Design a protein around this ligand. Structure first.
Ligand SMILES: O=C(O)C1=C[C@@H](O)[C@H](O)[C@H](O)C1
Ligand SMILES: [Br-]
Ligand SMILES: [Br-]
Ligand SMILES: [Br-]
Ligand SMILES: [Br-]
Ligand SMILES: [Br-]
Ligand SMILES: [Br-]
Length: 265
């Protein structure tokens, strides 16, 4: 009888429990639980540090992904590369940080090979950079409000072998950045992306990390313009597979989890 869950703020909207509980039932782990825990970045170490021995792991969403990486005493190679963690896994003497959002991006997109755009510089942004690199994109433009954090994302991109550069939202380069790009991964709030949706609408493929509320203004714009829209639910599914594997020690029951995603509203 084990416990897991998802930590973040806000957290009430999370559809992680639906996916994990479906997986645990498919795996015959019928008494396992998975709950939502309201938790900011500052609070994460005290929340996780308070868990009893039946906790096997927690998923971590905004705003705790940087805090999660720091909290863990061991980190996977990919967490160490990305610089944030959306997964903490209990070990015999502590916790290990992993990042499965890379899988989320790569799995949701399926393929990508040309110029890409990433919006944002939060905890999911470096996973988008690495996931795009894994797919084989030739170059990435990072568009964010925080230029110092964007510089760190440029270094990351460069270190994984991808030509990366920064473009400010407001100074006049966004339109040209969009024109060159074949895929856009958005990690910014829907309320921020809304004001640029007309400029961004021309992108051929959009992966939006947001899934609630849905559709985002950005997704409506791209969809209307003829572009392919991939919702945050697809990213959620694909990142969830590796989380279930680390929490359970068993292969992810992909069929069952895909059916659970289809059973959501
Ligand atoms: O439940 C959720 O909404 C999420 C779980 C995290 O593991 C994912 O990485 C993502 O940030 C969202
Ligand atoms: Br416990
Ligand atoms: Br272990
Ligand atoms: Br975050
Ligand atoms: Br522009
Ligand atoms: Br904001
Ligand atoms: Br969907």
């Amino acid at each position: 009888p084990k416990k897991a869950g998802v930590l973040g703020s806000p957290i009430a909207h999370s559809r992680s429990p639906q996916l994990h509980l479906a997986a645990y039932r498919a795996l015959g782990l019928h008494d396992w639980t998975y709950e939502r825990i309201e938790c900011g970045a500052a609070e994460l170490p005290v929340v996780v540090g308070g868990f009893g021995p039946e906790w096997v792991g927690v998923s971590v969403t905004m705003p705790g992904k940087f805090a999660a990486l720091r909290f863990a005493d061991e980190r996977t190679a990919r967490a160490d590369l990305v610089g944030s963690a959306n997964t903490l896994v209990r070990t015999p003497h502590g916790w290990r940080a992993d990042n499965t959002d890379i899988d989320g991006v790569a799995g949701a997109l399926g393929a990508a090979a040309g110029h890409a755009l990433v919006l944002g510089s939060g905890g999911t942004a470096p996973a988008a950079v690495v996931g795009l690199a894994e797919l084989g994109v030739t170059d990435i433009t990072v568009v964010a409000r925080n230029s110092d954090k964007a510089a760190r994302l440029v270094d990351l991109g460069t270190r994984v072998g991808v030509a990366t550069r920064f473009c400010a939202f407001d100074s006049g380069g966004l339109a040209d950045a969009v024109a060159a790009a074949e895929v856009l991964v958005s990690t910014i709030p829907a309320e921020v992306a809304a004001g640029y949706a007309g400029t961004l609408a021309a992108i051929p493929v959009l992966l939006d990390a947001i899934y609630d509320p849905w559709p985002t203004p950005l997704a409506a714009a791209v969809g209307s313009a003829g572009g392919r829209v991939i919702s945050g639910l697809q990213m959620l599914l694909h990142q969830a597979f590796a989380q279930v594997e680390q929490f359970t020690g068993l292969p992810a029951p992909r069929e069952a989890m895909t059916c659970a995603l289809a059973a959501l509203d």
